[PDB]
Short mmCIF file of C-alpha atoms in Angstrom, two decimals:
data_model
loop_
_atom_site.label_atom_id
_atom_site.label_comp_id
_atom_site.label_asym_id
_atom_site.label_seq_id
_atom_site.Cartn_x
_atom_site.Cartn_y
_atom_site.Cartn_z
CA UNK A 10 -3.40 -1.31 -18.25
CA UNK A 11 -0.18 0.02 -16.11
CA UNK A 12 2.74 1.05 -18.52
CA UNK A 13 6.25 1.84 -18.44
CA UNK A 14 9.12 3.73 -18.06
CA UNK A 15 11.35 3.83 -20.66
CA UNK A 16 14.72 5.07 -22.80
CA UNK A 17 13.15 8.36 -24.38
CA UNK A 18 10.20 9.43 -21.67
CA UNK A 19 10.45 13.24 -20.83
CA UNK A 20 9.79 12.80 -17.14
CA UNK A 21 9.70 14.76 -14.26
CA UNK A 22 10.38 13.92 -10.88
CA UNK A 23 8.75 15.58 -8.36
CA UNK A 24 8.69 15.25 -4.06
CA UNK A 25 6.15 15.31 -1.65
CA UNK A 26 6.98 18.68 0.97
CA UNK A 27 4.81 18.65 3.95
CA UNK A 28 5.29 22.53 5.63
CA UNK A 29 3.14 24.93 7.07
CA UNK A 30 1.82 21.21 8.32
CA UNK A 31 1.01 21.66 4.89
CA UNK A 32 1.68 18.70 1.85
CA UNK A 33 2.77 20.40 -1.13
CA UNK A 34 4.40 19.55 -4.70
CA UNK A 35 7.84 20.05 -5.32
CA UNK A 36 9.30 19.64 -9.03
CA UNK A 37 13.23 19.04 -9.55
CA UNK A 38 14.84 22.39 -11.91
CA UNK A 39 18.13 23.71 -13.47
CA UNK A 40 18.53 26.40 -15.06
CA UNK A 41 21.18 25.16 -16.96
CA UNK A 42 22.50 28.14 -18.11
CA UNK A 43 24.95 30.60 -15.80
CA UNK A 44 23.89 28.56 -12.48
CA UNK A 45 24.30 24.43 -12.81
CA UNK A 46 22.95 24.13 -9.67
CA UNK A 47 19.41 22.34 -8.87
CA UNK A 48 16.76 23.90 -7.15
CA UNK A 49 12.99 23.57 -6.57
CA UNK A 50 9.93 24.06 -8.51
CA UNK A 51 6.75 24.99 -6.22
CA UNK A 52 3.93 23.49 -8.44
CA UNK A 53 0.45 22.70 -5.50
CA UNK A 54 -0.99 26.05 -6.71
CA UNK A 55 -1.02 25.82 -10.86
CA UNK A 56 -4.11 27.80 -10.58
CA UNK A 57 -2.53 30.83 -8.88
CA UNK A 58 0.75 30.13 -10.37
CA UNK A 59 2.35 28.16 -13.33
CA UNK A 60 5.43 25.66 -13.20
CA UNK A 61 8.00 26.75 -15.17
CA UNK A 62 8.09 22.96 -16.92
CA UNK A 63 10.21 23.55 -19.75
CA UNK A 64 13.30 23.51 -16.98
CA UNK A 65 11.64 20.85 -14.25
CA UNK A 66 11.78 18.93 -17.32
CA UNK A 67 14.43 15.45 -17.94
CA UNK A 68 14.93 13.00 -21.13
CA UNK A 69 15.55 9.76 -19.84
CA UNK A 70 18.95 8.19 -21.99
CA UNK A 71 20.09 5.98 -21.31
CA UNK A 72 18.72 2.38 -18.79
CA UNK A 73 22.56 -0.70 -18.88
CA UNK A 74 23.59 -2.08 -15.89
CA UNK A 75 26.09 -1.56 -13.77
CA UNK A 76 28.18 -4.39 -15.14
CA UNK A 77 28.04 -2.96 -18.55
CA UNK A 78 28.89 0.91 -16.96
CA UNK A 79 31.43 -0.07 -14.99
CA UNK A 80 32.82 -1.73 -17.96
CA UNK A 81 32.47 0.31 -20.89
CA UNK A 82 33.66 3.29 -19.01
CA UNK A 83 36.71 1.04 -18.15
CA UNK A 84 37.08 0.78 -22.04
CA UNK A 85 13.42 1.83 -26.73
CA UNK A 86 14.80 -0.11 -23.79
CA UNK A 87 12.96 -0.52 -20.62
CA UNK A 88 13.64 1.33 -17.31
CA UNK A 89 14.65 -1.87 -13.90
CA UNK A 90 15.17 -1.16 -10.74
CA UNK A 91 18.78 -1.09 -10.07
CA UNK A 92 20.05 0.47 -13.74
CA UNK A 93 22.08 3.21 -13.87
CA UNK A 94 19.42 5.72 -15.51
CA UNK A 95 20.92 8.64 -17.32
CA UNK A 96 18.39 12.18 -17.11
CA UNK A 97 19.43 14.96 -19.28
CA UNK A 98 18.23 19.00 -19.51
CA UNK A 99 15.54 19.24 -22.03
CA UNK A 100 16.69 22.50 -22.52
CA UNK A 101 19.66 22.34 -21.08
CA UNK A 102 21.30 19.69 -22.46
CA UNK A 103 23.55 19.12 -20.30
CA UNK A 104 22.41 15.54 -17.13
CA UNK A 105 22.00 15.18 -14.21
CA UNK A 106 25.30 15.07 -11.31
CA UNK A 107 26.49 15.37 -8.80
CA UNK A 108 29.28 17.66 -7.53
CA UNK A 109 31.87 16.88 -5.85
CA UNK A 110 31.51 20.73 -3.99
CA UNK A 111 29.57 21.08 -0.93
CA UNK A 112 27.73 23.73 0.25
CA UNK A 113 25.32 21.80 1.55
CA UNK A 114 24.97 23.35 5.49
CA UNK A 115 26.86 21.66 7.99
CA UNK A 116 26.29 18.45 6.39
CA UNK A 117 29.70 17.50 5.44
CA UNK A 118 29.12 14.25 3.76
CA UNK A 119 26.28 15.90 1.78
CA UNK A 120 27.50 16.89 -1.92
CA UNK A 121 25.64 20.03 -4.41
CA UNK A 122 23.14 18.09 -7.41
CA UNK A 123 23.87 19.75 -10.16
CA UNK A 124 24.64 19.62 -14.38
CA UNK A 125 27.41 18.28 -16.28
CA UNK A 126 27.97 19.08 -19.38
CA UNK A 127 30.82 15.71 -20.07
CA UNK A 128 28.78 12.38 -19.58
CA UNK A 129 31.68 10.17 -19.13
CA UNK A 130 32.98 9.36 -15.02
CA UNK A 131 30.14 7.51 -12.63
CA UNK A 132 28.82 11.22 -11.67
CA UNK A 133 25.69 11.89 -14.18
CA UNK A 134 24.81 8.44 -13.84
CA UNK A 135 22.36 6.84 -11.29
CA UNK A 136 20.84 3.63 -10.19
CA UNK A 137 17.15 3.24 -9.85
CA UNK A 138 15.92 1.13 -6.68
CA UNK A 139 12.86 0.09 -5.10
CA UNK A 140 10.38 3.01 -2.85
CA UNK A 141 8.84 0.32 -0.18
CA UNK A 142 8.11 -3.50 -1.18
CA UNK A 143 5.33 -3.57 -3.97
CA UNK A 144 8.39 -3.58 -6.36
CA UNK A 145 11.23 -5.05 -6.76
CA UNK A 146 14.71 -5.65 -7.43
CA UNK A 147 15.58 -6.25 -10.50
CA UNK A 148 11.97 -6.18 -11.95
CA UNK A 149 10.84 -3.84 -14.46
CA UNK A 150 9.73 0.07 -13.51
CA UNK A 151 6.43 1.77 -13.85
CA UNK A 152 5.02 5.09 -14.48
CA UNK A 153 3.47 6.43 -11.03
CA UNK A 154 5.86 4.13 -8.92
CA UNK A 155 8.34 6.17 -6.22
CA UNK A 156 11.54 6.27 -7.67
CA UNK A 157 14.88 6.24 -4.76
CA UNK A 158 17.68 7.23 -7.18
CA UNK A 159 21.45 6.74 -5.03
CA UNK A 160 25.07 8.56 -7.29
CA UNK A 161 27.58 5.81 -8.73
CA UNK A 162 30.57 8.54 -7.50
CA UNK A 163 28.98 9.94 -4.31
CA UNK A 164 26.62 6.15 -3.19
CA UNK A 165 24.43 9.14 -1.72
CA UNK A 166 20.74 9.57 -2.82
CA UNK A 167 18.72 12.55 -3.61
CA UNK A 168 17.64 14.13 -0.72
CA UNK A 169 15.02 16.65 -0.34
CA UNK A 170 16.60 18.48 2.78
CA UNK A 171 14.56 21.01 5.27
CA UNK A 172 17.14 22.34 7.56
CA UNK A 173 17.88 25.96 5.26
CA UNK A 174 15.54 28.14 5.34
CA UNK A 175 14.53 27.50 1.45
CA UNK A 176 13.79 23.25 0.58
CA UNK A 177 17.01 21.98 -1.74
CA UNK A 178 18.10 19.51 -3.20
CA UNK A 179 21.77 17.84 -1.47
CA UNK A 180 23.10 14.04 -2.14
CA UNK A 181 23.15 12.81 2.05
CA UNK A 182 22.67 8.89 2.50
CA UNK A 183 19.06 10.11 4.04
CA UNK A 184 16.91 9.46 1.67
CA UNK A 185 13.83 11.03 -0.03
CA UNK A 186 11.05 9.56 -2.11
CA UNK A 187 10.46 11.47 -6.07
CA UNK A 188 7.16 10.65 -8.15
CA UNK A 189 8.17 10.09 -11.63
CA UNK A 190 5.64 11.64 -13.84
CA UNK A 191 6.30 11.08 -17.71
CA UNK A 192 5.37 14.18 -19.83
CA UNK A 193 5.53 13.06 -23.36
CA UNK A 194 6.27 9.75 -24.85
CA UNK A 195 8.49 8.25 -27.91
CA UNK A 196 5.83 8.54 -29.98
CA UNK A 197 5.63 11.18 -31.08
CA UNK A 198 2.50 10.87 -33.51
CA UNK A 199 3.70 12.36 -37.10
CA UNK A 200 5.32 16.11 -37.46
CA UNK A 201 3.14 19.91 -37.07
CA UNK A 202 0.17 18.44 -34.23
CA UNK A 203 0.03 20.67 -32.00
CA UNK A 204 2.04 19.63 -28.34
CA UNK A 205 1.49 21.05 -25.11
CA UNK A 206 5.10 22.52 -23.96
CA UNK A 207 5.68 23.76 -27.79
CA UNK A 208 7.18 28.07 -29.24
CA UNK A 209 4.85 28.40 -31.57
CA UNK A 210 4.09 31.83 -34.00
CA UNK A 211 0.27 32.42 -33.76
CA UNK A 212 0.27 34.06 -38.23
CA UNK A 213 -3.45 35.40 -39.19
CA UNK A 214 -3.39 35.85 -42.37
CA UNK A 215 -1.70 34.14 -44.95
CA UNK A 216 1.30 33.63 -43.91
CA UNK A 217 1.38 38.63 -43.14
CA UNK A 218 1.03 39.29 -39.98
CA UNK A 219 2.41 37.95 -35.94
CA UNK A 220 0.92 38.05 -32.78
CA UNK A 221 3.58 40.64 -31.01
CA UNK A 222 4.57 42.60 -28.46
CA UNK A 223 6.25 45.82 -28.76
CA UNK A 224 9.73 45.51 -28.68
CA UNK A 225 11.57 48.16 -30.42
CA UNK A 226 12.01 50.79 -28.16
CA UNK A 227 12.09 48.78 -25.82
CA UNK A 228 9.91 50.47 -22.38
CA UNK A 229 8.46 48.00 -19.79
CA UNK A 230 4.59 49.52 -20.56
CA UNK A 231 5.58 49.22 -24.75
CA UNK A 232 5.90 45.16 -23.55
CA UNK A 233 3.51 44.94 -21.60
CA UNK A 234 0.97 45.51 -24.81
CA UNK A 235 0.12 42.90 -27.00
CA UNK A 236 -0.27 43.12 -31.32
CA UNK A 237 -0.28 42.29 -34.79
CA UNK A 238 2.63 42.83 -37.56
CA UNK A 239 4.59 42.26 -39.60
CA UNK A 240 7.85 42.08 -41.81
CA UNK A 241 11.06 40.29 -39.93
CA UNK A 242 9.75 40.49 -36.96
CA UNK A 243 8.38 36.12 -38.02
CA UNK A 244 12.24 35.69 -37.96
CA UNK A 245 13.13 37.36 -34.85
CA UNK A 246 12.38 36.50 -31.36
CA UNK A 247 9.98 38.80 -30.10
CA UNK A 248 7.00 37.26 -32.21
CA UNK A 249 7.34 33.31 -30.44
CA UNK A 250 4.59 31.86 -27.47
CA UNK A 251 4.85 28.86 -25.31
CA UNK A 252 2.27 26.69 -25.34
CA UNK A 253 1.52 26.04 -22.15
CA UNK A 254 -0.95 22.76 -20.40
CA UNK A 255 -2.68 23.21 -17.94
CA UNK A 256 -1.39 19.85 -15.94
CA UNK A 257 1.36 18.35 -15.28
CA UNK A 258 1.37 15.40 -16.04
CA UNK A 259 1.10 14.13 -19.44
CA UNK A 260 1.84 18.05 -20.35
CA UNK A 261 3.42 16.62 -23.59
CA UNK A 262 0.37 15.10 -24.93
CA UNK A 263 -1.54 16.31 -28.24
CA UNK A 264 -3.27 19.76 -27.94
CA UNK A 265 -7.18 18.95 -27.84
CA UNK A 266 -9.72 20.98 -29.60
CA UNK A 267 -11.16 23.15 -26.50
CA UNK A 268 -8.25 21.81 -23.96
CA UNK A 269 -7.84 25.12 -21.51
CA UNK A 270 -4.07 26.62 -21.94
CA UNK A 271 -1.42 29.25 -21.31
CA UNK A 272 1.04 31.40 -23.41
CA UNK A 273 3.93 32.67 -22.61
CA UNK A 274 5.95 35.48 -24.27
CA UNK A 275 9.67 32.68 -24.69
CA UNK A 276 12.04 36.01 -24.65
CA UNK A 277 9.25 39.06 -22.49
CA UNK A 278 8.66 35.39 -19.16
CA UNK A 279 5.37 37.65 -18.70
CA UNK A 280 1.78 35.21 -19.73
CA UNK A 281 -0.59 36.97 -22.04
CA UNK A 282 -4.13 37.58 -20.31
CA UNK A 283 -7.01 39.25 -20.76
CA UNK A 284 -8.28 42.39 -18.54
CA UNK A 285 -12.08 43.31 -20.58
CA UNK A 286 -11.32 46.67 -19.87
CA UNK A 287 -8.59 46.64 -21.58
CA UNK A 288 -8.57 43.19 -24.17
CA UNK A 289 -5.08 41.57 -23.63
CA UNK A 290 -2.36 42.48 -22.15
CA UNK A 291 0.63 40.00 -20.59
CA UNK A 292 1.30 40.21 -17.18
CA UNK A 293 3.97 38.12 -14.98
CA UNK A 294 4.30 35.06 -13.44
CA UNK A 295 3.10 36.07 -10.02
CA UNK A 296 -0.40 36.62 -11.66
CA UNK A 297 -1.60 34.49 -13.74
CA UNK A 298 -4.64 32.84 -12.50
CA UNK A 299 -5.73 30.31 -15.21
CA UNK A 300 -8.55 32.27 -14.58
CA UNK A 301 -6.95 35.35 -16.88
CA UNK A 302 -4.52 33.63 -18.41
CA UNK A 303 -6.61 30.09 -20.04
CA UNK A 304 -7.07 30.62 -23.60
CA UNK A 305 -8.72 27.83 -26.20
CA UNK A 306 -8.21 27.45 -29.44
CA UNK A 307 -11.82 26.10 -31.39
CA UNK A 308 -11.84 24.69 -35.03
CA UNK A 309 -15.08 26.63 -35.69
CA UNK A 310 -16.10 29.76 -34.16
CA UNK A 311 -19.56 28.71 -33.55
CA UNK A 312 -20.60 28.49 -30.07
CA UNK A 313 -20.91 24.95 -30.29
CA UNK A 314 -20.05 24.58 -26.10
CA UNK A 315 -17.91 20.99 -25.89
CA UNK A 316 -17.71 21.75 -22.97
CA UNK A 317 -14.73 19.31 -21.47
CA UNK A 318 -13.52 16.62 -22.03
CA UNK A 319 -12.34 13.21 -19.91
CA UNK A 320 -8.52 14.05 -19.75
CA UNK A 321 -6.39 11.42 -20.67
CA UNK A 322 -3.81 10.09 -19.99
CA UNK A 323 -1.68 9.94 -22.31
CA UNK A 324 -0.52 11.71 -26.12
CA UNK A 325 -3.50 11.00 -27.21
CA UNK A 326 -5.16 12.14 -30.73
CA UNK A 327 -2.99 14.37 -33.26
CA UNK A 328 -6.33 16.92 -33.63
CA UNK A 329 -4.52 20.65 -35.18
CA UNK A 330 -1.20 20.28 -36.95
CA UNK A 331 1.24 22.53 -37.67
CA UNK A 332 0.32 25.19 -40.61
CA UNK A 333 -3.32 23.62 -42.56
CA UNK A 334 -5.16 23.71 -38.98
CA UNK A 335 -6.82 26.85 -38.73
CA UNK A 336 -7.80 27.72 -35.28
CA UNK A 337 -9.83 29.97 -33.33
CA UNK A 338 -8.11 31.23 -30.14
CA UNK A 339 -11.60 32.02 -27.40
CA UNK A 340 -10.92 33.51 -24.35
CA UNK A 341 -11.71 29.65 -21.56
CA UNK A 342 -13.31 32.48 -18.93
CA UNK A 343 -15.59 35.23 -20.78
CA UNK A 344 -15.85 32.98 -24.54
CA UNK A 345 -14.27 36.27 -25.98
CA UNK A 346 -12.69 35.56 -29.99
CA UNK A 347 -9.55 37.22 -30.23
CA UNK A 348 -9.98 39.79 -33.76
CA UNK A 349 -7.85 43.17 -34.65
CA UNK A 350 -9.34 45.98 -34.40
CA UNK A 351 -7.96 47.46 -37.56
CA UNK A 352 -7.01 50.44 -36.76
CA UNK A 353 -6.13 52.37 -39.95
CA UNK A 354 4.92 47.64 -39.29
CA UNK B 25 34.82 -6.16 6.88
CA UNK B 26 36.39 -3.21 6.96
CA UNK B 27 34.06 -2.20 3.56
CA UNK B 28 30.60 -3.10 4.77
CA UNK B 29 31.15 -1.55 9.12
CA UNK B 30 33.20 1.30 7.01
CA UNK B 31 29.16 1.08 4.59
CA UNK B 32 27.14 0.71 7.74
CA UNK B 33 28.79 3.33 9.74
CA UNK B 34 28.57 5.82 6.92
CA UNK B 35 24.46 4.87 7.20
CA UNK B 36 24.08 5.64 10.45
CA UNK B 37 26.61 8.55 10.75
CA UNK B 38 25.50 8.49 14.93
CA UNK B 39 27.87 6.38 15.44
CA UNK B 40 30.67 8.61 15.74
CA UNK B 41 29.20 10.29 18.76
CA UNK B 42 27.40 13.73 19.53
CA UNK B 43 31.01 14.93 17.61
CA UNK B 44 32.01 13.37 14.21
CA UNK B 45 28.21 13.64 13.82
CA UNK B 46 27.84 17.08 12.46
CA UNK B 47 24.82 19.72 12.45
CA UNK B 48 26.17 21.78 15.18
CA UNK B 49 29.42 19.11 15.94
CA UNK B 50 32.32 20.36 17.11
CA UNK B 51 35.59 18.79 15.55
CA UNK B 52 36.94 16.16 17.25
CA UNK B 53 39.95 17.81 18.65
CA UNK B 54 37.78 20.34 20.07
CA UNK B 55 35.31 17.08 21.60
CA UNK B 56 38.80 15.62 23.01
CA UNK B 57 40.10 18.99 24.22
CA UNK B 58 35.95 19.17 26.32
CA UNK B 59 36.54 15.49 27.39
CA UNK B 60 40.06 16.37 29.33
CA UNK B 61 38.21 19.12 30.77
CA UNK B 62 35.36 17.76 31.82
CA UNK B 63 37.89 15.05 33.62
CA UNK B 64 39.64 17.54 35.52
CA UNK B 65 36.93 19.26 36.69
CA UNK B 66 35.43 16.85 38.85
CA UNK B 67 31.05 16.77 39.19
CA UNK B 68 31.29 16.38 35.45
CA UNK B 69 33.78 13.20 35.58
CA UNK B 70 32.22 11.57 39.05
CA UNK B 71 28.56 10.39 39.84
CA UNK B 72 29.02 13.62 43.41
#
């Protein structure tokens, strides 16, 4: 049936861009730290390069109406069209806003879209408007609908501009249709219960090992390789991996046994991968091509060959739980089962 | 009426003319000087 966006769901703002006469899907992103301005990340070639949904994602915080908005700035709710919504960047913690600066290329009345810390002010508030005649003003918003976002302070729209050589996001009086896809919902079944897009440590033995990379001496090729280490690396940041689901929508769902995913070293920024001649190795974002960076968790090492399951659109059952559940890391393509060389810190 | 007219005009920026439209449109002063030159010079002001 039809689910509705709520005041705590984790969503991504997506737009459709057709350049070189080929339609592409692009997601709004913002680093936040060191760069307030927003940009676009192309998620079309997810099989060729990974999208960084970690910064591409946002969370809805408020859905209060405009009357209460201006009222209380003068002093799990459901999204309804025309409400003033607050979008908070999940990573940076700032809120999407319409910056007063005008970097736009000879657009004059257009502004720039960025991130702001303070919630006060109408700049951070956006109003949802129906894309077409299927929806109605005041009706609740549904999953998969297209939206038009209007800034309160500037009364402009989140506009995809092709004017520059690259594609930009600017608050202009031209409107572009944004499709909202959900990542995670407010249910968030219990604790543990490994969830897509999580930062974790992979411990081998009795809480006495961690899969990390050589980082004490620095060096690019030294960081490149992967090994097992014991000690304070269990506390340092060099033993942190993000588990990225291969799909965009519902990427914050519970990870199930046999589900393919990618492992990204958080500090190094490169994706772990297999090359049969030289075992495991990290490699750049550009080279991650699914076949080499696709791994999975197995409950039993026996070759059950469970195959592919139907991709349910939701939280799903919580199969793998943190700590208690034991997992076997298996390469999706080759079917190899990790293991250690047992070389005799 | 003033608010409605301003809102409609800013929704449709082409109403301001070649100048004041942006994206390669010169300033109001430049447009007025160009129009003065056009009025002074025949074959651009009349039909001819």
